[PDB]
Structure formats: C-alpha cells, structure tokens
C-alpha cells in the first residue's frame, strides 16, 4: 500500500470584502498542487471544486453578500463529500475558501472517525458565537458550531441544525494566535482550551510547541488528526493574499516544521488549507507567493522533506 489523498475545492465565503477567497481553490491548483502530490507517490482522487449556490435566492445581491443559510447548507454538502473521501480510505485535503468550511470537513471527518483531534493553525481562534460577532462573520465562528461544551451558548440558525457537535475542549489545540476578540479569550480560559500564541512560540520555540500539542492530543492513545491550517497563520510578508493579515506570524520554516511533525505521526486523516484570497494581492507575485506557500504546507503535511530522501534511490550509475 501507498498513502492515498483526496482533494476537494470548497470555494465558500459570505462575499463582502472577502468575495475573492472563492478563487483560492483554483489559485492553489494553478500553483501545481496535483503534480507535487503525484511526485510524493500519493494515490490521488480529485472531486474538483464544489458549486456555492445561495438558497433560497440565487441573485447577484445574494452572491455578493451571502445569507448564512447558504453557508450552513454548503457545509452540509461538504461534510458528506469528506465522509465519502474518508470512507473510501483517503486522507482528505479541502482547499478554501474561508475558514467556515471547517464546519463541513470536521463534521464529515468525525462521522467515521469520532475520536479525531484538531490542530488549528491560525492567527485567529475562530470561536465567536453567532451572539458575540455579526451575521456575515461565520468565517470567525466555525469552532463554536463544533465544540461540545458550547451547545447552550450557540443558537439554532436555519441551515445549521444538521450539525452534531463532535469535538471536546481537550481535543483541539490552537497554534499561531495573535488576534483574539475578548469573548474568544473568555471561551479559551473558561473551557480550558489549550493554545500556543506567537508569544508562547517566541518563549518555547516551535519544536517544544509540537511536542506539547501531541502530549495533550495523542499523549494517551493514537487518534486521527485533522489539520485546519489558515494561511493567515504565516506572517503577512510570506502570505499577503489573505483577508485578515496580522503582523508577527509564523516564518516559512516554523510552518514547514509544524507540517513535518504532523506528517511524522502517521495519523493525518484530514487537512484544510483556508483563506487564500488572490484578489487582495497587490500584484500577480503576491498572489503566486501565497499560492506556492499553501502548496508547500500540503506537500510537507504528506511527506515532502527539506533534506530529500522521501523517494527510494537504489545504486549510482557506474562510468561504463
């Protein structure tokens, strides 16, 4: 057997200033993702890029400022595709699209893998409730929908009643945090959610951060890993084609190291790469840099090394 990878485009957003994020899937593709995954020796299955259609009204307005029901229903279609990809025996890679798609991927991942854990790499905790933030900011709430302890703080919206909370507070760990709303800070502290801010990373170093993240998640038993990786986790100089750029993020090397440690476990079952928005780039070069970096995270998460040695080499040719 060789390691099998399924790839899904989920070009999901709520429009407004972040409409361009629906072009992230195609941009990551055009930076040569499937070729890189093929060179690794992965058996590949492409579901292509899913339609994102506003319900109940598919007009220009509802496509540029998207009602939340549309985001709820799109995530429900996504969950089933991820659960198909996983039931078929593929580690499932979903290309964003905004971080609201984590509602689809983690729910769908959790169906056949209920004991999964989550490594959330992001500048943001994305844990606001529909009551702590606005109606067009579902990209900043995915985790409130999935977390089990938060059920009584989370109202029932049209398009989101399908969702079964599938993560406990000890089963998610955050890496990269540097932009956290006050209620998000409250939730983290109150419900004991473990997190490594950029300050923690500066103090401990990323090597120790990954050692502690695994101690918390897989310290006692082996469990399927879901990597939810926001490109905005990287410093804005490395990944500028993103919608909420925050100065002081991961360097390229910290980000590859995360991805190498995740690979080295042998337990990566699902991966999101979100928030690549090529229209917010000032130049083609900013667009391509952000898209090349996303490809590097996915490749590295599935066994690309920096020192070579992934593919087996037998002997050297002799002169003649």
């Amino acid at each position, epitope marked *: 057997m060789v390691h099998s990878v399924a790839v899904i485009g989920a070009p999901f957003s709520q*429009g407004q*200033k972040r*409409k*361009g994020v*629906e072009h992230g899937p195609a941009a990551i593709r055009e930076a040569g993702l499937m070729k890189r995954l093929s060179s690794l020796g992965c058996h590949l299955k492409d579901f292509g890029d899913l339609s994102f259609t506003p319900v109940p009204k598919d007009d*220009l*307005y509802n*496509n540029l*400022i998207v009602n939340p029901r549309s985001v709820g229903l799109a995530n429900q279609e996504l969950a089933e595709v991820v659960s198909r990809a996983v039931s078929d025996g593929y580690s499932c890679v979903t290309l964003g699209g905004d971080h609201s798609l984590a509602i689809g991927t983690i729910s769908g991942h959790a169906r056949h893998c209920p004991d999964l854990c989550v490594v959330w790499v992001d500048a943001h905790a994305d844990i606001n409730t529909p009551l702590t933030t606005s109606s067009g900011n579902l990209h900043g709430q995915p985790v409130s929908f999935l977390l089990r302890e938060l059920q009584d703080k989370v109202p029932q919206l049209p398009g989101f009643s399908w969702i079964k909370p599938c993560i406990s507070s000890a089963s998610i760990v955050y890496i990269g945090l540097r932009d956290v709303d006050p209620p998000e800070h409250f939730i983290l502290k109150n419900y004991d959610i473990q997190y490594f801010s950029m300050r923690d990373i500066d103090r401990l170093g990323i090597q120790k951060v990954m050692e502690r993240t695994f101690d918390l998640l897989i310290g006692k038993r082996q469990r399927p890993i879901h990597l939810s990786f926001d490109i905005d986790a990287f410093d804005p100089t490395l990944a500028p084609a993103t919608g909420t750029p925050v100065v002081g993020g991961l360097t390229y090397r910290e980000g590859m190291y995360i991805a190498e440690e995740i690979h080295n476990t042998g337990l990566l079952s699902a991966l999101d790469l979100v928030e690549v928005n090529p229209q917010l780039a000032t130049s083609e070069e900013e667009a391509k840099t952000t898209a090349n970096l996303a490809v590097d995270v996915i490749a590295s998460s599935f066994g690309q090394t920096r020192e070579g040695g992934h593919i087996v080499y037998d002997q050297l040719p002799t002169p003649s």
Partner: antibody
Amino acid sequence: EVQLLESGGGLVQPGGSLRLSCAASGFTFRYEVAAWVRQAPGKGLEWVSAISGPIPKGYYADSVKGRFTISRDNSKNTLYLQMNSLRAEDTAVYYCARLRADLGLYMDLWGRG
Amino acid sequence: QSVLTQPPSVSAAPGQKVTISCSGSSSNIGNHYVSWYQQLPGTAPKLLIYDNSERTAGVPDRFSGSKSGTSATLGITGLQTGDEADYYCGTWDELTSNLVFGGGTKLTVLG
C-alpha cells in the same frame, strides 16, 4: 494605476448581433466581479449584466435575459458582452464597471464608454 | 431605468452649498446601501460615495452622503465650477433583483 477600455460598439441593424470588449489594465479582472451598465442618450443608467465567482456565473436584467451573454478571457484580461436580436431600444452608450461589496454593493471603477 | 427619484436639476453660486435627494421604496433604499456617481460632460461615471456615506480616495468631506428610511441625500458644500456634473444615486432592488439607479441630477454652478 487601474483603468478599463471598451471597444466594438458602432452601427448595427434591428435583429442584428454585436460583441463589445472591455480590457482591464493595472489589476487582474479575473478575481473581480465585473458588470455592464448602459445610458440611452440624455437619460439615466440601466444595469445590463454581471459575471462573478470562479465558475463563472452570469446575471442579467430581464430587459436583456436570453439575448445578451457576458463572458471573460482571463488571458487577455478582457470582459465581453455578446448582444443578439438587438432592438432600437437597445440604443445606448455601454460602460463596463468593477462591482465590489462591503456592507452593500458599489461600482468603484468605470471605463470610457 | 428610474426606479429611484432624483430632481432633474439643482443650482447654487460658487462657494455655496446644495443637497440632492434620492427617493426609493422598502425593497431598495429601504433595505440596501446607496452609492453616488459623478459624471462630468463626455466622461465616465466616478464613484463618490458607497455604503450610504463612505467617501472614496481623494473625495473631500464637503461631498457628504446620508440615508434615512427610504430616502438618501448628497450634500455638496463649497461649490466649485469643477463640480458641474450629472449625479446619480444607485443601490440594489430586492423586488426586481436589479442594481437600480436614479434618473440623474444636472448640477450648475451659477456663473
């Protein structure tokens, strides 16, 4: 550092066909939502067509649906409007515009017409 | 077009002030953000105002947008002769599923 230039307009007979262009420069139109708006001489502005998302998808006014087709060539960074079964009332100057959203919708860049 | 109502013309002297009303329904201005476009003779419309009162880069504070109920206003103070344009309001209509516009207002600075 950013502009739009239309061409292809002129004189055509009733029941005729005609294709307008709109080349962007200084930005990548591809990742942007684009629109056509028109002005019958000495009158207001009518919205005609819009093209959004990565598929992409086209939206039309009922006064043109089934006669006009909006498209784009990402290679030539150009926006098109194909106009079939044309009528005297279709007589107008035609602008291509960039359509964006924040709280609401707005057209922040217009071509020469 | 002309879902939205504007006056056909307004005038005042240089340095003086004027407002332009934009009148709609519950299904357009009532529930959607108004934008204001300036068109100088023989030129392309330019976005002045969006989301009711957000000025674009370069547009000065003497160009002011406002909105109440189902109506919107464009205030211009300090009138210069370079203000002599046709001005249009615009928004979304959730009745016809159209971007809609007013019929325009010809501004004259009295010389």
